[PDB]
């Protein structure tokens, strides 16, 4: 209650100034999908320190992506039709061909916890039997480890696929720059002196 | 001087540690001393604890793992206050000592380390090939040729470029990275030529003129705008070092031209870098506020090209397009050459364009500090104004600027209890005199003194006027800061008057610390208390002068006579709390216990006496004189007999009623009395109320009675019939050079880009306008001006109109103050009593100069900065004979005036004879031309001379003003060494070197023997209110109390022909 | 003396901030110094800790949401003694910096802000028509003629009076 | 970095005038010699030196140190008039306090003042002020602007120079402090070199550090400043004027001028102040209305003048310190 | 809101003066056809700046 | 838009109260089995009356 009040209090969606600072709006307006393309990022992801309600913001850091963004390279020299000054795509996650654990599975591990820690406060909050705080925390715990194994080859092997798919022939345009809180696609429209574009 | 002389550096290239000891770098043993191991703070930005990694660590990277370790959790723990020095250092050190840069130490005495690249291989866990390179092959990183360093990396894994993401300072900000530097594997100069040639593709990249490790690398901006945070920071840094080069001073810089090439910019960056090359500045010296630093810079170009210059307006529209080029400047160019010469391997930037000293300019002053800029508008510039429309300042929306009634006192507490004794001088008060005085006095009462003056005492209540200073004394004590008094100390009395609770002590000085968690309620004064409290100081002091023990003797008491008494009485006991038996009492109607509540005509049988009594009652008696005069004559009678020394506020007094009191005590006790007129420092600046001081001297006096009296004239004149007061206005619509304007300030909001012009046309009225911007996003300046009835007399004279204009054209973008926080402006400035005084001498003279048939020029003999100006119609010539006036002859004639900076002061060789002329002799016969002190005997001879001189001419009037003697004895007794004091028979009239004076009588007797018609004229209250009212000026405590005497004593002589 | 001589004011009419900077008003950065940013006390009335909002904030309104934020819980915590100077300022400042008056900054050097009306549109969550007016149409609030200010509001949503 | 005892940091020198008469024969040669130097710009080598060696950084860490300890409660003994007191003060932003002297009111709880921001002109101006109060009667250690006497600061880009003086002179009755000069921000009037007519100012001791560069190329630049000192001169009893050049010609011309705008000459001196860009041949003339003639004025050699008198220039470039490693 | 503030106020219906100058009424009454045949014109269409 | 002020009010009403029910319950030492089942019930209409 308190956190979602100081915070939604400060705009529910921001847009960006000219000097690129973030200008949040005032109302706590809802947020439709048809409003997706147009200076108005959803506000939760702004990822901008907000004095008051901080637990809400911290829980928020969990969402940021992992993978880096490779610049197609191959599709470009091949000559493939890209059209975006400089093509490139963003890969979900680096292929950690090194040793021990990951960085991706290892990340999810701390994500499950920070969150789990959060589930704990809410639960002890609504005085609940330890029988279920545990059974469920136990469940939350199974995929920390459980997604440790899947992410092994998922990230190595599943990733290289994107590694190439990022550059198929027609499969142009840049989908995501990698920075949630500030990436608006390139708006391409067919202009026409005649009718309405 | 000429050729710039530098010592290039390549800092980073030489900040990468030697390999063989690239281990102790993490400092494994010792703990990082804040001094040179990191910079750090916590800002009043509520939170903002920045941690700067000073050292070889500046440029680093972290990780996903590095980013776990506390220290990145250690910030979000003390949101409230600065991290605990301990928990910080101790902690940090843990991580510091963790980073273990993979490497292979050697023995060669030339290797280094590249570091950066490495640091980065570590960043990610050695997966990104370059990184997967170092791991098994670690030796790859050592290196000797600053560039081969890298070319090795590339050559092996074969690639065009490696991207080095680039973090940001302040380890506490995981909030992305503006951009990133790309390292281009381009060896030979020719190769790069072409790398960046094709680089006119890809959205936003930009590069620096030269290069670290001398390996062409470029920046890539994650956003169009983030691109601007960088340039701005950097272009600005350029003028920072460039000022130095112009100056000629070894500048060990990473590279001559600091600016950076918008390769693919996009208009905003286009016009930003556009400015960059032009170095439009003047060596600031100040410090510009970062963050808004960009908008500040981006804004300036908009206005630069905007006021542009036609010629250079193009020279700039040029670089606006051809921007991938670089614009050095002959000097620069010449330098870069020394560089290429040294070793033809320095692969610095290809396309460029020498300038040719740049087509002149405007040193566009600036800074984004926090003061607001006080400007002092010049009379005549050189932008011969045609006309230009009347400007409209907006509405000052209080919470930015509020306007208030009377610039709060602000004075040292100790000088606050100072009065003056106008001593009686009039051997006899004959019936002939009584006949005239009673009528004059009754007449004033019949009408009620000047509406203008009375309005003034009430608005200017010595309460509020002198409150915040007093409020301040109390404000600190409540929090334990006033630890030194001395009981008898004036300072002790004041803190006390100010605080309700009981003040205490110990071995003096130390004031018993405020008892635990409790707080006294700041005292409640009446606006009569400071005055009465002050009168009491005057009395104890009047007891024997020389003494600083203001604690009512041992068992002696006093009674307070002021209607509506206490805290006046109450503060006295708390103050006199410890001293044996001191009895304090307070009468007056409406007075609440502990205070008897009598009524004016003291009830018979009620006998009271008490060493010193103070009577402040009397106030208004419907009687309409005869009787009102009598009711009070009566008040002083009891107040008088019953007590040894006491103060009675006689209000009026006229030279009649106050004098009548003297005759009465004269007979109700043979051997007269000794009385004085105590004008007390604190007491509604104006208010011509005077307290007679009465005591039974034991040596006659052979004088009593009064004639002029500095105190009496204050209320003697002020005749009234003023024809209404001049309410200070606040018009906000600046007309172009047109007299019309009524006294009052210009508080207005003009939009910028216009400020230059508004301010420029504005100089014609006031003569010092303050201004500010609140933020860099407020496209409106704020101007505050207060029309100054002297500047107008001067600007308007013989029409015309040329202002400094373009010169103020320079501030426009930024140099215009910048405060952000409610200002207070008072509809009434404050002013050193001395200044108010000659200002006053002028109101008598101007009116006169406006009353004499034909009168051709005003010969102001010894002006100085031409004060006399506002004392001459906008018609006559004004001619100053002043040695140090130094005015350009042309400006002198533009505002039609003349200068004879030729000191003389002797007849026979003094061409005064120019009849139909007025000679204004203010000051002059004071201090020699050499800013000295004309000895009194000699000071007399000057008047003797102008006299023989005025004697053989005609239709000329000489105004000579001198200082009669009475001020000295009066001053020695009075104790208000504000701005007079009396150093060994003289008087440091503010900033002036003491000045021995002369006898009013000897002055009169000499010219009298000679025959020149004369009048010793001294200003009056009518003129005082007039001098002050159209001027926004107020009087301010000390002044009033002492200005009466000074004005009166400082007479004037009209030697009229 | 005789004829009274005054200088009328219309304080409120001239206490409403200029629009282009009706943002820094909430003082987003700096923290409210007791001197001129609020008046405050605790009285020997056993309890009675009064907090006076000195400044352009005097006339305000709050809400159901504004009325949640501690500071309205911060009084009922030190029933015994004066709120801890620290926990007070520090705190207050949080809320202060929260109120975000909807508006549309301009450049005209004469606009103002009406404020009061607005402050109130914010009070309730922009539901009461006058309030449902400003939201999408924010420029409505700036104004130059002290009276036209309002007459604009009415003219559009057509009503005899706003409360 | 400097490294010196703070107390010896405010020390100057008076090169006293000695030249019974300044004959026209001399004027013929001096004006040309002086104009010639201005025509060219003194030695490239020397000028490069004053700028690199800024009496700012040079003398900073010592000053930084004074501030560094106070922030942590270690400076518990001053004396108001103390030079030492003035320095800690110039160094710290917040308001310095006291009690029974010595003991400086302990830093208020968990708060910290921001170390002062100097211009590299402040130590010099601050120092000139010390020179003035001291010049008042020499023998004395009370550097607190008398009782109700004031001074005005004339240096473009003023404050903290002026600001430090009030914090320092904070308690002393009425002391009024002012600062003009272009680019100066309130509390500082912002006039411009050729003082705007009608604007009358005076204040016991004035310090003028403005003047700096006047495109005029002499004749006039000489005159613009001769003019600056004229007002600065009449209007005040004792004041410092940074005369920059000065040559045995222009500095001397100032002497002849005050000579007639007031019969009984004047008493002037050349104050080379301790703190002030080691080199920089800038000298402040000290001017006061003595009451005993002088029968000397005018200069010939002067320790101060030769500093800028020679340095003829035509140096043929500077010798940049290298660092060869072979 | 802002624009139909000054517009309805300029006058919500007007008439043509002996010399065309549109006489703009200051009221803003509705517009029943009942005065289609009178001398009033709906104001919107005044097509005057 | 979003939530209410009315449902949002009931939400804090259920809590302040619930918090109150909590003290009374821990007061009369009761099994956590029911403190919860019932608090759970109290909770259903916070959201349920939303």
UniProtKB/Swiss-Prot annotation, chain A:
Where found? Virion
| Top-rank taxon, per record | Viruses
How it assembles, according to the record, is: Homodecamer; each decamer is made up of two conformers of VP2, called VP2A and VP2B. 12 homodecamers assemble to form an icosahedral capsid.
What family is it from? Belongs to the turreted BTV-fold inner capsid family.
Functional note? Inner capsid protein that self-assembles to form an icosahedral capsid with a T=2 symmetry, which consists of 120 copies of VP2, with channels at each of its five-fold vertices. This capsid constitutes the innermost concentric layer of the viral mature particle.
Q: What is this protein called?
A: Inner capsid protein VP1
Provenance organism:
Bombyx mori cytoplasmic polyhedrosis virus
Q: Which residues of the full protein are shown?
A: 545 to 741 of 1333
From Swiss-Prot, chain E:
Localization in the cell: Virion
- Which species does the entry assign this protein to? Bombyx mori cytoplasmic polyhedrosis virus
Disulfide cysteine pairs (residue numbers): none
Query: What is the protein name for this chain?
Result: Inner capsid protein VP1
Similarity remark: Belongs to the turreted BTV-fold inner capsid family.
In which domain of life is the source organism classified? Answer: Viruses
According to its UniProt entry, the function of this protein is described as: Inner capsid protein that self-assembles to form an icosahedral capsid with a T=2 symmetry, which consists of 120 copies of VP2, with channels at each of its five-fold vertices. This capsid constitutes the innermost concentric layer of the viral mature particle.
Quaternary structure, from the entry: Homodecamer; each decamer is made up of two conformers of VP2, called VP2A and VP2B. 12 homodecamers assemble to form an icosahedral capsid.
């Amino acid at each position: 209650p308190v956190e979602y009040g100081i915070f939604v209090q400060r705009g529910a969606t921001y847009t960006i100034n000219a000097a690129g600072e973030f200008e949040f709006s005032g109302r706590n307006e809802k947020w439709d999908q048809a409003l997706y393309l147009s200076e108005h990022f959803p506000a939760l992801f702004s990822d901008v320190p907000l004095a008051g309600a901080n637990t809400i913001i911290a829980i928020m850091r969990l969402f940021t992506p992992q993978g880096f963004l490779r610049t197609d390279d191959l599709a470009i020299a091949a000559n493939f039709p890209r059209a975006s000054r400089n093509p490139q795509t963003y890969i979900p996650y680096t292929n950690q061909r090194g040793t021990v654990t990951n960085e991706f599975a290892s990340r999810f591990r701390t994500i499950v916890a920070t969150l789990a820690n959060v589930v704990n406060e809410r639960a002890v909050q609504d005085d609940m039997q330890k029988a279920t705080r545990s059974c469920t925390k136990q469940w939350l715990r199974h995929l920390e480890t459980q997604f440790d194994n899947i992410a092994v080859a998922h990230t190595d092997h599943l990733s290289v696929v994107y590694a190439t798919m990022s550059n198929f022939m027609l499969n142009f345009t840049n989908n995501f720059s990698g920075n949630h809180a500030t990436f608006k696609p390139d708006q391409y429209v067919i202009t026409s002196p005649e009718g309405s574009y | 001087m000429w050729h710039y002389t530098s010592i290039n550096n390549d800092t980073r290239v030489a900040l990468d540690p030697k390999p063989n000891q690239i281990r102790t770098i993490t400092k494994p043993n010792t703990v990082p001393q804040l001094g040179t191991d990191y910079l750090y703070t916590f800002n009043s930005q509520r939170r903002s604890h920045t941690l700067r990694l000073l050292g070889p660590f500046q440029y680093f990277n972290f990780s996903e793992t590095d980013r776990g370790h506390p220290l990145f959790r250690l910030p979000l723990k003390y949101p409230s206050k600065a991290i605990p020095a301990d928990e910080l250092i101790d902690n940090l050190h843990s991580w510091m000592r963790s980073v273990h840069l993979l490497h292979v130490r050697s023995e060669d005495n030339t290797l280094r380390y590249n570091w950066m690249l490495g640091v980065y291989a570590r960043s990610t866990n050695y997966t990104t090939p370059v990184g997967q390179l170092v791991v098994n092959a670690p030796a790859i990183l050592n290196y000797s040729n600053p560039q081969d360093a890298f070319n090795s990396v590339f050559v092996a894994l074969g690639i065009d470029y490696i991207d080095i993401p680039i973090t940001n300072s302040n380890i506490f900000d995981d909030s992305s990275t503006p951009y990133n530097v790309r390292i281009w594997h381009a060896p030979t100069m020719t190769e790069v030529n072409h790398i960046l040639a094709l680089m006119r593709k890809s959205t936003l990249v930009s590069t620096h003129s030269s290069w670290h490790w001398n390996v062409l690398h470029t920046f890539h901006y994650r956003s169009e705008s983030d691109m601007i945070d960088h340039f701005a920071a950097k272009i600005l840094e350029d003028w920072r070092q460039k000022e130095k080069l112009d100056k000629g001073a070894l500048v060990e810089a990473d590279r001559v031209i600091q600016r950076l090439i918008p390769l693919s910019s996009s208009t905003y960056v286009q016009r930003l870098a556009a400015i960059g090359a032009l170095y439009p500045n003047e060596f600031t010296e100040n410090v510009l506020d970062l963050s808004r630093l960009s908008t500040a810079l981006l804004q300036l170009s908009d206005t630069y090209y905007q006021h542009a210059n036609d010629q250079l307006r193009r020279l700039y529209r040029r670089m606006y397009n051809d921007s991938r080029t670089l614009y050095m400047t002959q000097r620069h160019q010449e330098l870069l050459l020394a560089q290429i010469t040294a070793d033809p391997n320095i692969l610095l930037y290809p396309y460029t364009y020498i300038f040719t000293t740049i087509p002149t300019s405007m040193n566009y002053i600036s800074n984004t500090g926090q003061g607001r800029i006080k400007h002092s508008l010049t009379v005549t510039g050189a932008t011969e104004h045609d006309t230009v429309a009347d400007i409209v300042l907006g509405q000052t929306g209080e919470d930015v600027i509020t306007i208030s009634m009377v610039e709060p006192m602000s004075i040292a507490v100790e000088d606050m209890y100072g009065y003056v004794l106008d001593t009686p001088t009039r051997d006899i008060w004959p019936a002939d005199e009584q006949i005239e005085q009673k009528g004059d006095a009754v007449a004033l009462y019949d009408t009620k003194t000047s509406r203008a003056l009375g309005m003034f005492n009430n608005t200017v209540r010595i309460d509020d006027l002198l409150s915040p200073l007093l409020s301040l004394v109390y404000r600190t004590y409540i929090k334990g800061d006033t630890m030194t008094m001395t009981q008898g100390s004036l300072d002790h009395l004041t803190l006390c008057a100010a605080v309700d609770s009981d003040i205490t002590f110990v071995g003096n000085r130390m004031i018993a610390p405020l008892p635990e968690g409790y707080i006294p309620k700041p005292m409640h004064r009446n606006n009569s208390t400071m005055k009465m409290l002050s009168l009491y100081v005057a009395l104890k002091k009047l007891e024997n002068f020389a003494t600083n023990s203001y604690l009512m003797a041992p068992d002696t008491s006093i009674i307070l006579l002021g209607a509506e008494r206490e805290p006046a009485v109450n503060i006295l006991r708390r103050f006199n709390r410890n001293v044996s038996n001191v009895r304090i009492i307070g009468m007056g109607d409406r007075a609440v216990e502990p205070n008897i509540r009598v009524r004016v005509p003291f009830p018979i049988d009620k006998n009271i006496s008490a060493d010193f009594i103070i009577c402040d009652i009397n106030s208004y008696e419907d009687q309409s004189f005869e009787s009102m005069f009598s009711e009070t004559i009566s008040v002083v009678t009891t107040c008088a007999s019953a007590a040894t020394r006491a103060l009675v506020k006689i209000n009026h007094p006229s030279e009649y009623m106050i004098n009548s009191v003297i005759e009465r005590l004269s007979q109700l006790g043979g051997v007269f009395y000794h009385t004085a007129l105590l004008k007390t420092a604190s007491q509604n600046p104006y208010s011509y109320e005077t307290y007679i001081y009465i005591t039974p001297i034991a040596a006659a006096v052979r004088f009593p009675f009064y004639s002029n009296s500095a105190m009496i004239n204050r209320y003697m004149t002020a005749v009234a019939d003023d024809e209404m007061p001049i309410i200070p206005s606040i018009h906000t619509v600046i007309k172009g050079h047109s007299n019309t304007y009524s006294p009052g300030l210009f508080c207005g909001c003009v939009d910028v880009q216009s400020a230059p012009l508004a301010l420029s046309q504005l100089k014609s009225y006031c003569s010092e306008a303050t201004t500010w911007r609140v933020d860099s996003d407020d496209n409106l300046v704020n101007i505050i001006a207060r029309i100054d009835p002297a500047r107008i007399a001067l600007e308007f004279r013989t029409r015309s109109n040329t202002s400094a204009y373009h010169e103020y054209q320079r501030y426009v973008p930024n140099g215009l103050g910048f405060k952000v926080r409610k200002t207070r402006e008072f509809r009434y400035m404050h002013r050193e009593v001395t200044f108010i005084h000659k200002l006053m001498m002028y109101a008598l003279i101007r009116e006169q100069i406006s009353l004499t048939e034909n009168m051709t020029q005003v010969v102001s003999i010894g002006g100085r900065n031409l004060a006399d100006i506002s004392v001459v119609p906008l018609n006559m010539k004004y001619v100053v004979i002043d040695p140090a006036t130094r005015i350009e002859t042309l400006t002198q004639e533009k505002k039609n005036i003349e200068v004879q900076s030729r000191p003389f002061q002797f007849d026979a060789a003094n061409m005064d004879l120019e009849n139909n002329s007025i000679y204004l002799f203010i000051a002059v016969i004071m201090n020699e031309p050499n800013g000295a002190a004309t000895p009194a005997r000699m000071q007399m001879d000057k008047i003797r001379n102008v006299a023989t001189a005025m004697l053989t001419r005609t239709n000329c009037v000489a105004y000579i003003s001198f200082y009669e003697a009475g001020i000295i004895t009066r001053l020695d007794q009075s104790t208000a060494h504000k701005t007079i004091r009396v150093e060994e028979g003289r008087l440091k009239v503010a900033n002036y070197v003491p000045v021995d004076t002369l006898v009013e009588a000897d002055v009169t007797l000499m010219l009298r023997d000679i025959g020149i018609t004369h009048e010793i004229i001294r200003p009056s209250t009518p003129e005082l209110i007039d001098a002050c009212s159209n001027y926004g000026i107020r009087l301010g405590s000390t002044g009033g109390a002492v200005l009466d005497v000074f004005n009166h004593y400082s007479p004037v002589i009209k030697l009229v022909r």
